[PDB]
Enzyme design. Structure first.
Site, PDB file in Angstrom:
ATOM      1  N   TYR A  26     -11.006 -37.964   4.575  1.00  0.00           N
ATOM      2  CA  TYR A  26      -9.697 -37.979   4.124  1.00  0.00           C
ATOM      3  C   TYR A  26     -10.067 -37.830   2.649  1.00  0.00           C
ATOM      4  O   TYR A  26     -11.413 -37.210   2.196  1.00  0.00           O
ATOM      5  CB  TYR A  26      -8.675 -39.154   4.014  1.00  0.00           C
ATOM      6  CG  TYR A  26     -10.378 -39.868   3.181  1.00  0.00           C
ATOM      7  CD1 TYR A  26      -9.028 -40.159   1.247  1.00  0.00           C
ATOM      8  CD2 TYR A  26     -10.341 -40.522   3.264  1.00  0.00           C
ATOM      9  CE1 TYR A  26     -10.096 -40.656   0.856  1.00  0.00           C
ATOM     10  CE2 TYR A  26     -11.256 -41.651   1.977  1.00  0.00           C
ATOM     11  CZ  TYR A  26     -11.190 -41.384   1.342  1.00  0.00           C
ATOM     12  OH  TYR A  26     -11.757 -42.157   0.036  1.00  0.00           O
ATOM     13  N   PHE A  36      -7.557 -37.241  -6.532  1.00  0.00           N
ATOM     14  CA  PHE A  36      -8.954 -37.497  -7.051  1.00  0.00           C
ATOM     15  C   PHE A  36     -10.235 -38.735  -5.758  1.00  0.00           C
ATOM     16  O   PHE A  36     -11.146 -38.905  -6.143  1.00  0.00           O
ATOM     17  CB  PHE A  36      -7.995 -39.652  -7.660  1.00  0.00           C
ATOM     18  CG  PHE A  36      -6.778 -39.660  -6.103  1.00  0.00           C
ATOM     19  CD1 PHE A  36      -7.810 -40.414  -5.453  1.00  0.00           C
ATOM     20  CD2 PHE A  36      -6.035 -39.136  -5.855  1.00  0.00           C
ATOM     21  CE1 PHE A  36      -7.287 -41.416  -4.215  1.00  0.00           C
ATOM     22  CE2 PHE A  36      -4.942 -39.786  -4.610  1.00  0.00           C
ATOM     23  CZ  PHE A  36      -5.634 -40.179  -4.019  1.00  0.00           C
ATOM     24  N   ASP A  37      -9.950 -37.847  -4.764  1.00  0.00           N
ATOM     25  CA  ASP A  37     -11.693 -38.772  -4.123  1.00  0.00           C
ATOM     26  C   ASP A  37     -10.835 -37.598  -2.398  1.00  0.00           C
ATOM     27  O   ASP A  37     -10.220 -37.600  -2.190  1.00  0.00           O
ATOM     28  CB  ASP A  37     -11.033 -39.736  -3.553  1.00  0.00           C
ATOM     29  CG  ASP A  37     -12.718 -40.082  -3.646  1.00  0.00           C
ATOM     30  OD1 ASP A  37     -13.782 -40.079  -3.579  1.00  0.00           O
ATOM     31  OD2 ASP A  37     -12.453 -40.718  -1.704  1.00  0.00           O
ATOM     32  N   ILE A  56      -4.317 -49.547   1.432  1.00  0.00           N
ATOM     33  CA  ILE A  56      -3.089 -49.899   1.299  1.00  0.00           C
ATOM     34  C   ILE A  56      -2.062 -49.637   2.893  1.00  0.00           C
ATOM     35  O   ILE A  56      -2.396 -48.990   2.862  1.00  0.00           O
ATOM     36  CB  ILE A  56      -3.101 -48.165  -0.083  1.00  0.00           C
ATOM     37  CG1 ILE A  56      -3.501 -47.348   1.017  1.00  0.00           C
ATOM     38  CG2 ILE A  56      -3.581 -48.446  -1.032  1.00  0.00           C
ATOM     39  CD1 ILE A  56      -2.921 -45.940  -0.536  1.00  0.00           C
ATOM     40  N   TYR A  82      -0.400 -48.397  -4.933  1.00  0.00           N
ATOM     41  CA  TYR A  82      -0.679 -49.255  -5.309  1.00  0.00           C
ATOM     42  C   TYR A  82       0.214 -49.696  -7.043  1.00  0.00           C
ATOM     43  O   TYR A  82       0.368 -50.697  -7.884  1.00  0.00           O
ATOM     44  CB  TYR A  82      -2.162 -48.450  -7.049  1.00  0.00           C
ATOM     45  CG  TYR A  82      -3.033 -48.123  -6.063  1.00  0.00           C
ATOM     46  CD1 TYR A  82      -3.722 -48.968  -5.189  1.00  0.00           C
ATOM     47  CD2 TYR A  82      -3.147 -46.680  -4.908  1.00  0.00           C
ATOM     48  CE1 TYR A  82      -4.946 -48.841  -4.362  1.00  0.00           C
ATOM     49  CE2 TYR A  82      -4.250 -46.288  -4.578  1.00  0.00           C
ATOM     50  CZ  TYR A  82      -5.751 -47.742  -3.907  1.00  0.00           C
ATOM     51  OH  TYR A  82      -6.046 -47.943  -3.326  1.00  0.00           O
ATOM     52  N   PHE A  99      -1.851 -37.785   1.439  1.00  0.00           N
ATOM     53  CA  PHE A  99      -3.337 -37.688   1.716  1.00  0.00           C
ATOM     54  C   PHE A  99      -3.476 -36.951   2.833  1.00  0.00           C
ATOM     55  O   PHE A  99      -2.717 -36.563   3.286  1.00  0.00           O
ATOM     56  CB  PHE A  99      -3.867 -39.510   2.273  1.00  0.00           C
ATOM     57  CG  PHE A  99      -3.821 -39.995   0.705  1.00  0.00           C
ATOM     58  CD1 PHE A  99      -5.324 -40.804   1.318  1.00  0.00           C
ATOM     59  CD2 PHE A  99      -2.936 -41.264   0.473  1.00  0.00           C
ATOM     60  CE1 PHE A  99      -5.535 -41.836  -0.400  1.00  0.00           C
ATOM     61  CE2 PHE A  99      -3.849 -41.961  -0.384  1.00  0.00           C
ATOM     62  CZ  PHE A  99      -5.436 -42.130  -0.762  1.00  0.00           C
TER      63      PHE A  99
HETATM   64  C1  LIG Z   1      -9.825 -46.203  -3.886  1.00  0.00           C
HETATM   65  C2  LIG Z   1      -9.578 -45.002  -3.688  1.00  0.00           C
HETATM   66  C3  LIG Z   1      -8.760 -44.708  -5.542  1.00  0.00           C
HETATM   67  C4  LIG Z   1     -10.550 -43.304  -4.841  1.00  0.00           C
HETATM   68  O1  LIG Z   1     -11.724 -44.448  -3.508  1.00  0.00           O
HETATM   69  C5  LIG Z   1     -12.882 -44.093  -4.102  1.00  0.00           C
HETATM   70  O2  LIG Z   1     -13.278 -43.252  -5.149  1.00  0.00           O
HETATM   71  C6  LIG Z   1     -13.950 -44.064  -3.005  1.00  0.00           C
HETATM   72  C7  LIG Z   1     -13.239 -44.602  -1.676  1.00  0.00           C
HETATM   73  C8  LIG Z   1     -15.235 -45.382  -1.031  1.00  0.00           C
HETATM   74  C9  LIG Z   1     -14.687 -46.215   0.145  1.00  0.00           C
HETATM   75  C10 LIG Z   1     -14.825 -47.786  -0.711  1.00  0.00           C
HETATM   76  C11 LIG Z   1     -13.140 -48.048   0.334  1.00  0.00           C
HETATM   77  C12 LIG Z   1     -12.334 -49.408   0.153  1.00  0.00           C
HETATM   78  C13 LIG Z   1     -11.177 -49.384   0.656  1.00  0.00           C
HETATM   79  C14 LIG Z   1     -10.236 -50.113  -0.233  1.00  0.00           C
HETATM   80  C15 LIG Z   1      -9.827 -49.781  -1.241  1.00  0.00           C
HETATM   81  C16 LIG Z   1      -8.498 -49.574  -1.335  1.00  0.00           C
HETATM   82  O3  LIG Z   1      -7.881 -48.110  -0.980  1.00  0.00           O
HETATM   83  C17 LIG Z   1      -7.317 -47.138   0.049  1.00  0.00           C
HETATM   84  O4  LIG Z   1      -6.354 -47.523   0.212  1.00  0.00           O
HETATM   85  C18 LIG Z   1      -7.393 -45.717   0.178  1.00  0.00           C
HETATM   86  C19 LIG Z   1      -7.437 -45.386   2.194  1.00  0.00           C
HETATM   87  C20 LIG Z   1      -8.315 -45.241   1.615  1.00  0.00           C
HETATM   88  C21 LIG Z   1      -9.932 -44.851   1.364  1.00  0.00           C
HETATM   89  C22 LIG Z   1      -9.823 -45.482  -0.488  1.00  0.00           C
HETATM   90  N1  LIG Z   1      -8.689 -44.790  -0.827  1.00  0.00           N
HETATM   91  C23 LIG Z   1      -7.275 -44.661  -1.969  1.00  0.00           C
HETATM   92  O5  LIG Z   1      -7.160 -44.759  -2.282  1.00  0.00           O
HETATM   93  C24 LIG Z   1      -8.768 -43.999  -3.134  1.00  0.00           C
HETATM   94  O6  LIG Z   1      -9.264 -43.017  -3.058  1.00  0.00           O
END
Ligand SMILES: CC1(C)COC(=O)CCCCCCCCCCCOC(=O)[C@@H]2CCCCN2C(=O)C1=O
Ligand SMILES: CC1(C)COC(=O)CCCCCCCCCCCOC(=O)[C@@H]2CCCCN2C(=O)C1=O
EC number: 5.2.1.8
Lengths: 107, 107
Positions: A26, A36-37, A56, A82, A99
């Site tokens: 992703y 952002f990531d 989420i 969020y 995403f």
């Molecule tokens: C966290 C955030 C801002 C930033 O993520 C990172 O910087 C690194 C991710 C590394 C893996 C650990 C994530 C654990 C998942 C729980 C966090 C909740 O995140 C989400 O639901 C979404 C979707 C999956 C990718 C992370 N996610 C996100 O919203 C994001 O991309």
């Protein structure tokens, strides 16, 4: 809610079931395009168990509509993401997130 | 006063000057994150002249210390905002205000 929009078709047959681990790549960006990531930048696919609620709501419901091999754009309104909190230091309050997700495989 | 907490940095070198028009996107919230207004929601950048006193003092002092491209969370005490009068039907007397501000550009 979560809007799903196909970039590349998947097989149209294998959809995740609750309890399966989805393996995805992703890239996430704010509604204005600021990214952002990305798991691609780490070249480490991300794995989560569908139904476990560790990601989420927009991801739980959006990715469940995807078949193996699909690449899709999911735009997630603040209430499925969020909310008013954001995610400290990365996501501002009340943000719609976009995403680009590719469902690599199920485990 | 106004506390500036950075969400994403700007160049850290182009700061607004007296008489310039600051172009910003913002979301205004009370301390619990409840949103009372947002320029984003009407998809129109807000513009104001730094030094004209047409926006509350916390915005004049807060945005003067932001550089272009910065997105910051400004936490403003009531004496730098609307004090005891508040803003009828939106902001209560002696309310602390939080604004998410992005300084998009200068004119
Ligand atoms: C966290 C955030 C801002 C930033 O993520 C990172 O910087 C690194 C991710 C590394 C893996 C650990 C994530 C654990 C998942 C729980 C966090 C909740 O995140 C989400 O639901 C979404 C979707 C999956 C990718 C992370 N996610 C996100 O919203 C994001 O991309
Ligand atoms: C007024 C209030 C409750 C509601 O604002 C609006 O509805 C904005 C409408 C669009 C622009 C109209 C011109 C407003 C000129 C400035 C008025 C004083 O407002 C403020 O200082 C702060 C900070 C800037 C955004 C408006 N601002 C605020 O405190 C607000 O968000």
């Amino acid at each position: 809610g979560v809007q799903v929009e196909t970039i590349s078709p998947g097989d149209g047959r294998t959809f995740p079931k609750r309890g399966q681990t989805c393996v995805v790549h992703y890239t996430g960006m704010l509604e204005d395009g600021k990214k952002f990531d990305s798991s691609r930048d780490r070249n480490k696919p991300f794995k989560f168990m569908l139904g476990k609620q560790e990601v989420i709501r927009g991801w739980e419901e959006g990715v469940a509509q995807m078949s193996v091999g699909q690449r899709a754009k999911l735009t997630i309104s603040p209430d499925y993401a969020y909310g008013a909190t954001g995610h400290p230091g990365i996501i501002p309050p009340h943000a719609t997130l976009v995403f680009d997700v590719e469902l690599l495989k199920l485990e």
